[PDB]
Design a protein around this ligand. Structure first.
Ligand code: BGC
Length: 791
């Protein structure tokens, strides 16, 4: 089989994401830009369009990046003031783009009254571009040049505001920055254009010129101040952060307790037209544990466009306490012409708005439950402007799922609690989070897998398992203790077993393993496109937050469908994404390659990406599992967090990726969750992921990540602790066959501290995964051959 990867269709797919992911925040009709307008573009970052964040998910090599000025010229709908372009060009020869550990921003060119006045005299409209990047190992700081405007950027904005009566501000940013000073200066239009990959300027020009009507929505709540965010109190400590806000993350906090601290609510975004959402039929089916809600969205303005219907549930406070509203469903309309409408119907399972009882107060400890009382469903344009769709009342609690006490905090701390005041409004009070009473050593011992007796005369290939000819158990008996100790080691970076410049090879990492037809499976960064450290080019796609802002799983899936083929072309089997850690705080540096403060949106967008990658047999690796919500101190840092917050917020997106997304590969973190490293955490990697969610796949460490037993010293070679957790793969070693990290797999096995059954389980996970990859198909000679056309 031979498949064409059409590069022009790939471009168009990515461009569609850009034009659906831009978020228009304010506009007085200055957008869209009028046909034949002359635009003056301000901001030195105009010449170096941020196509991505920095670090592992920002090192995609490309031949060309289309920035905003070039996008606008290629549109043929406007022209750009060339004199001002040359002023920026000539100044930049003297003040070159700093490539660094790259800085968050570039120094702005100071502007004079003469430049700005002369620009306005020869143009119809000013566009001011403020650029920010961020990423791995540095957190975004609440200072000028990072989250705040620089003094010279502010001066630029004030001068342009004075001399132009039409002003447009664009935020070419990985994550949201302070809007207070920008809002005070009061431009005529404000749009967040994120970082759109290599064709970002094309999709951005589409929305600016009106060829596409913007339809992007915020995936985070924008508060007035950094200190309004509930997590700011407990964010940015390199050693330990207590997740005291608990389930009250983002709009779960603000809509419940602090509506007046919101500038822009979750799900907010506007269009060049206006829409009217009319609530429709509502039914509930308690026996099936679903409800069905309908509404109609009508374009009531004068230009075609899409809108998003967003559905929320208000649960009764009960004994647990609840956020006012939780997102349970959304649907983006087709393009609606003026005066036309679309009926949207959603069926919502009760598990979308259940609560995890981690205290026992409901009578069902360690369960997801719907407490007795009234459930009100809302629909609207955003969480704030969502209106009653229907209600139903439960006279008794319904247990949606029985789970276990898992990943519980090892120390007490106080968490936020919804308290219903005398009047009936909700205030924040605090309560003690109960401590874990789980016997961890016992749990491991009681659920120990059975050893498979070894048999080295067996000549079964991995091909014989794939065809159904033999059981995986029969095959795995062939692996020696050497083979077992070797197969749990990933080799990289730049292993010679796979495409050069990628992150890792795993599976067939010795002559012996490859002789059994276990192929070398290739892993590579990242969510926004293949990072090839050989210098080879690949498609640079929009950042994760831009993807999520589309509220459009279909457009995301379509784009990653092309990535699926591109990966096969490069013989990359595992793309190291989606990044899908919750936006707990706006200052986390890696927010650009994650999706949302909301777990449902997070899991739904992740799943769309995975479905895309699955189209032609490629795959993603969900990361970082879990609670890597802060870059500072991420090697040592301990996230202290309640079971409920884990179950409803931080794990929830990952759960969705497994059950809806078909996720079969996970990456753990550099850090600790509840007092041990995640790579050695049994509750995370076995109890929750496998035994409760039913995940069938592989777990790998983060690259050169530390591992420990609870209480013990962290090291980059405690592979025994890793295998005891069912974290299947240590990424990475320079030479896996030679044990170049000097790991303790065999010595622990020798001492009876690691059981061979545990190694065998990991080996089976690895082989089961490996045999369904395109690398196996290359051995079997039935892989897809890809040819790139259109270039
Ligand atoms: O590049 C391989 C890995 O490196 C680590 O530093 C990052 O945390 C991961 O996100 C990445 O996938």
């Amino acid at each position: 089989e031979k498949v064409i990867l059409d590069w022009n269709e790939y471009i168009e797919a990515a461009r569609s994401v850009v034009s659906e992911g831009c978020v228009l925040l304010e506009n007085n009709g200055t957008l869209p830009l009028e046909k034949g307008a002359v635009v003056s573009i301000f901001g030195r970052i105009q010449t170096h369009y941020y196509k991505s964040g920095t670090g592992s998910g920002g090192m995609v090599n490309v031949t060309h990046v289309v920035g905003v000025p070039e996008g606008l010229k290629l549109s043929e709908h406007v022209t750009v003031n060339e004199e001002l372009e040359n002023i920026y060009k000539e100044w930049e020869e003297e003040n070159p783009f700093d490539e660094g550990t790259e800085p968050w921003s570039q120094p702005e060119m100071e502007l004079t009254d003469e430049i700005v006045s002369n620009a306005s005299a020869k143009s119809d409209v000013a566009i001011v571009i403020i650029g920010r990047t961020a990423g791995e190992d540095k957190d975004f700081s609440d200072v000028a040049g990072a989250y705040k405007l620089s003094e010279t950027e502010e001066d630029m904005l004030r001068r342009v505001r004075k001399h132009f009566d039409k002003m447009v501000v664009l935020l070419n940013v990985g994550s949201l920055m302070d809007l207070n000073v920008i809002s005070e200066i009061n431009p005529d239009a404000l749009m967040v254009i994120w970082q759109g990959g290599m064709i970002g300027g094309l999709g951005t020009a589409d929305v600016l010129t009106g060829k596409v009507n913007p339809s992007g929505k915020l995936t985070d709540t924008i508060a007035y101040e950094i200190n309004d965010y509930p997590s700011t109190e407990n964010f940015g400590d390199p050693v330990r952060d207590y997740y005291a806000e608990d389930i009250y993350v983002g709009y779960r906090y603000f809509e419940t307790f602090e509506k007046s601290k919101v500038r822009y609510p979750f799900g907010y975004g506007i269009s060049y037209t206006e829409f009217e959402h009319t609530v429709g039929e509502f039914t509930a089916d308690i026996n099936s544990r679903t409800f069905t809600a309908s509404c109609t969205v009508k374009n009531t303005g004068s230009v075609a466009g899409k809108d998003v219907a967003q559905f929320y549930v208000s649960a009764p406070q009960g004994k647990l306490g609840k956020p006012e509203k939780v997102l349970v469903a959304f649907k983006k309309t087709g393009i609606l012409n003026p005066g036309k409408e679309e009926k949207i119907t959603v069926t919502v399972p009760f598990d979308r708005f259940a609560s995890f009882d981690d205290t026992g107060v409901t009578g069902a400890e360690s369960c997801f439950v719907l407490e007795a009382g009234e459930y009100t469903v809302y629909e609207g344009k955003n969480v704030r402007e969502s209106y009653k769709e229907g209600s139903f009342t439960l006279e008794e609690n319904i247990v949606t799922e029985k789970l276990s006490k898992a990943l519980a905090p090892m120390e007490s701390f106080k968490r936020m609690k919804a308290s219903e005041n005398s009047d009936g409004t909700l205030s924040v009070k605090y309560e003690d989070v109960p401590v874990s009473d789980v016997d961890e050593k016992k749990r491991r011992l009681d659920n120990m897998p059975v050893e498979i007796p070894q048999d080295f005369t067996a000549r079964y290939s991995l091909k014989d398992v794939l065809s159904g000819s033999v059981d995986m158990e029969k095959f795995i008996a062939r692996l020696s203790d050497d083979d077992l100790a070797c197969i749990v080691r990933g080799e990289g970076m730049g292993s010679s077993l796979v495409t050069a410049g990628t992150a890792a090879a795993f599976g067939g990492v010795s002559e012996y393993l490859r002789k059994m037809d276990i192929p070398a499976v290739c892993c590579d960064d990242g969510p926004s496109g293949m990072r090839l450290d050989s210098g080879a080019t690949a498609f640079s796609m929009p950042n994760g937050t831009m993807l999520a802002s589309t509220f459009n799983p279909d457009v995301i899936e379509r784009m990653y469908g092309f990535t699926s083929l591109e990966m096969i072309y490069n013989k990359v089997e595992c793309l190291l994404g989606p990044g899908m850690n919750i936006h707990r705080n706006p200052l986390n540096g890696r927010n650009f390659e994650y999706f949302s403060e909301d777990p449902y949106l997070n899991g739904t967008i992740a799943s769309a990406m995975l479905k895309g990658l699955h189209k032609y047999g490629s795959d993603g690796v969900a990361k970082h599992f879990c609670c890597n919500n802060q870059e500072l101190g991420r090697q040592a840092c301990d996230s202290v967090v309640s079971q409920r917050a884990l179950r409803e917020i931080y794990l929830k997106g990952f759960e969705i990726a497994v059950k809806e997304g078909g996720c079969k590969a996970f990456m753990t973190t550099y850090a600790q969750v509840n007092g041990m490293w995640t790579a050695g955490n049994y509750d995370l990697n076995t109890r929750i992921l496998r035994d409760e969610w039913g995940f069938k796949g592989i777990v790998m460490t983060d690259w050169w990540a530390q591992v420990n037993d609870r209480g013990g010293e962290p090291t980059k070679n405690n592979t025994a602790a890793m295998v005891r957790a069912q974290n299947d793969l240590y990424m990475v070693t320079a030479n896996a066959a030679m044990n170049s990290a000097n790991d303790n797999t065999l010595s622990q096995l020798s001492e009876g501290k690691l059981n061979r059954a545990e190694l065998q389980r990991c080996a089976m996970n690895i082989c089961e995964y490996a045999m369904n990859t395109m690398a196996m198909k290359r051995l079997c000679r039935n892989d897809i051959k890809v040819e790139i056309a259109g270039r």
